[PDB]
Amino acid sequence: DVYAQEKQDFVQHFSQIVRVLTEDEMGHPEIGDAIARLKEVLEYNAIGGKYNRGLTVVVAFRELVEPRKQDADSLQRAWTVGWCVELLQAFFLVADDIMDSSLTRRGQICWYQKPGVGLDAINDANLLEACIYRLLKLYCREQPYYLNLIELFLQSSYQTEIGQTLDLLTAPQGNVDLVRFTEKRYKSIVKYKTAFYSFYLPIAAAMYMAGIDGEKEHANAKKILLEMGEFFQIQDDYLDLFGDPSVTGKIGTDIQDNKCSWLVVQCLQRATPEQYQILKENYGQKEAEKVARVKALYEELDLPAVFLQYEEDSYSHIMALIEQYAAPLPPAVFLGLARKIYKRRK
Amino acid sequence: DVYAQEKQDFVQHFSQIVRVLTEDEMGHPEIGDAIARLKEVLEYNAIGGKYNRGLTVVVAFRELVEPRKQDADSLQRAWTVGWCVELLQAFFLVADDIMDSSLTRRGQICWYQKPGVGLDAINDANLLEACIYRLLKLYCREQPYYLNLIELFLQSSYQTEIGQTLDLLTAPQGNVDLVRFTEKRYKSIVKYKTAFYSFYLPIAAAMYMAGIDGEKEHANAKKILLEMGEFFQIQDDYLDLFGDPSVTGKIGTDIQDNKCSWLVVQCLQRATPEQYQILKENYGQKEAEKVARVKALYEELDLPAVFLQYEEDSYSHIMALIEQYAAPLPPAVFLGLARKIYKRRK
Ligand SMILES: CCCCn1cc[n+](CC(O)(P(=O)(O)O)P(=O)(O)O)c1
Ligand SMILES: CCCCn1cc[n+](CC(O)(P(=O)(O)O)P(=O)(O)O)c1
Ligand SMILES: [Mg+2]
Ligand SMILES: [Mg+2]
Ligand SMILES: [Mg+2]
Ligand SMILES: [Mg+2]
Ligand SMILES: [Mg+2]
Ligand SMILES: [Mg+2]
C-alpha cells in the first residue's frame, strides 16, 4: 500500500526531471541534437520498470523526516534523489544488457539491440550516469547532506562495478569450469553487484536527507539491507529460468552466458557425478537443446521446491534481523520494502 | 623542457597509485580477483601515452603555488590529481575504441580487441572512472578544494559525453550525408569531446589546488584553453589519415566510420561538384580502394598544405590570446603547454 500510494506522484514528476535536464542547457543551442538524444535515452531506459528503488527513497523520506519538515521543496528534492537511483539503475542495465547479450528488458527490445543504436549505447549509458550528479547539483547543492549524497552514489557505483567484474570473471564465455561456482563466490558477487545499490543506496540517501548520518546507524541499516539484496538477487536468478518472461519483461541468458547463478550452485551441491557430467557437457552454450537439458536436470533435482523453501527461511531471517537492528528507525521502513519484494514474480 | 623534467617523477609514482588502489581494499579478500582485474586494466590502459594532460596538472601546480607551499605532501596530491586526469583519459579511450571499431592504441591492440576481453571492456572503462573519485577521496578529502575538484571532474565528463553524442549522431554508419559536415557542427563537436577535458580540466584542477577559484579567472583561462583544444583536435584528425601509425601508435578509421573530420569539412569547401560526387560514392565505407580514393581527393586538393597553413595561423592566434588573457597567471603555464602540442606528430 505505501509504495502504491506514492507511485503516481513519483512518476508524474519525471516530466520535470526531463525538462530540467533539457532546459538548463539551451543557453547552449549548438548541443541541441545531443540534448534530444539524451531525452530519447531517458524515455526508453528510465521508464517502464516498477520503480521500487527510487520509490524506496521517497517512502523512507516520508517515514523518517518530521511532517513539519516535509515542505513542498524538500519533497521535490526527495523525488529527485529517488530518480537519481532510477538513473543509476538505467546506467547499469543498459551496459549489462550488452555484456549479457540480452534480448529484452521491461517488455521491449534492449536499447543496444535497436536498429541504429548498437554500441553507441555505451556512451548513452555514461550520459545517464552523468545526469545523477547534474541533478544532485541542481536540487541539492545548498543542502548540508550534498557531499554525503555525492560520495554515496559514487561509492555505490564503484562497489557495483567491482561486483560486475566478479560476475564477468566467474563467467568466461566458451570456458566451462564448474569448479569456480561455489557458495562463497556466489555470495560475494551478489553482495557487490546488487545489494549495495538496490537496497543500501536508497534507504541511506533518505537517512542522509533526514540528518541521520551516524556511522553506527548506517552500519545497522546495512546489516538488514545487504541480506535483503542477497535474497533479491537469488530471486532474479530463479526468474531467469522459471519466471514467465511476459511478467519479468526479459528473456533469460544465464545458462548460455556461463553464469555463477544460484541455480547452478544448488545444482552442483546435489548432483550425482553422472548428473555433474550432463551439466558439464551442456552448460554455457548457445544451443536450445543443451539449455533444455540443463533446465531438465534442475527440475529433476527439485530446484523449484528448494527455491520456495529458501524464500521462506530467508524471509524469517530478514524479519529476525529487523527485530535486532531496526531501532531507532521505524520498522515500517524495512517492512514496507520487504513486502514489495516478498514473492515477486517480476 | 619543463614537461620533460617532471615526467620521471610523475611516471614513477604510478606504482603508488596502483598500490593505494589495490591495498586499501584487501581488508575485503572476497573481491581479490576483481582487484587483480583492476590492476591489469590500469597497466594496459593508463600506461604508454605521452602524459601531457596529467603532466600539465603537475607543471602548472609548481608554477602557480608558492614554493614555500610545495611541501612533499601537497606535491604528492598534485601528481595524484594529475593521474586522475590520466584515468579520465583512459576511461574515454577504452569506450571510444569500441565505438570507433579501432584496431590499435599507443602501439598495442585496443583493450577490447584482446582475446578474452571483448565487451567486458565496458565495465573495465566504468571502473577506471570510479578510481578517480576514490583517489580524490584518499588524497584530497580534507583539502578546501575537494568539492571543487569533484564537481570539475564530473562536469568535464558530462561535457565530453555530450561531445561524444554529437560525434556519433553526426556519423551514422551506412548513412552518407555530406550535408551535415559543416564548420559550425565541427566546432561544436571538438569543443565538447576534446577541449574541456584535454585543456580546461588540467589547468583548472591546478588553479583550484592553488586557491585560485574566482569565476572570472577561470573564464579567462578557459578562453585560451578551448581554442588550443580545437587546434589539438584538428591536428588529431589530420594525423588519422596522414600521420605515420608507428609514431601515432594507432591506425586511422575516420573515413570508414563516416566521421565529421576537419579534413572532410575542408574538402567539402573546395570541391568541384564532380569531386563532391567522388567523395559521396566513396566515403564512410570499409573498402580499402574506396578509402584510397578519398585520400587521393584530399591530396589532389592540397589538404596537407592547408593543414600546415592553419597550424601556423592558429598558433599566432593562440599566442595573441595568451597576451590578452593570461594575467595574473604566469604566461609560462600557457606557453609550456602550447610548446608541447605545436607540430606534434603524436
Ligand atoms: C551492472 C549492474 C550489475 C547488477 N545487475 C545487473 C543486472 N542485474 C540483474 C540481473 O539479474 P544480472 O545480469 O543477472 O546480474 P538482469 O536479470 O540482467 O536484470 C543486476
Ligand atoms: C570519449 C572521449 C571523446 C574524445 N576523444 C576520443 C578519442 N579522441 C581522439 C580521437 O581523435 P577521436 O575517436 O577521433 O575523437 P582518437 O584518434 O580515437 O584518439 C577524442
Ligand atoms: Mg543481465
Ligand atoms: Mg549481468
Ligand atoms: Mg539476471
Ligand atoms: Mg577514436
Ligand atoms: Mg571517437
Ligand atoms: Mg581520431
XYZ file of C-alpha atoms and ligand atoms in Angstrom, chain A residues 92-93 95-97 99-100 102 105 164 167-168 193 233 236 253-254 257 259, ligand 4:
20
model
C 23.907 -0.359 -15.157
C 21.164 -2.164 -17.104
C 25.672 -1.671 -20.119
C 24.678 -5.021 -18.524
C 22.395 -5.921 -21.461
C 27.704 -7.604 -21.603
C 24.956 -10.258 -21.119
C 20.411 -9.966 -23.701
C 14.256 -5.669 -20.896
C 30.181 -6.794 -12.063
C 30.186 -11.609 -12.264
C 32.179 -11.466 -15.549
C 26.636 -6.307 -7.940
C 19.422 -11.471 -6.427
C 16.359 -12.744 -10.005
C 20.521 -15.922 -20.644
C 22.267 -17.290 -17.570
C 26.324 -16.853 -20.668
C 26.842 -17.700 -15.179
Mg 24.673 -9.188 -15.638
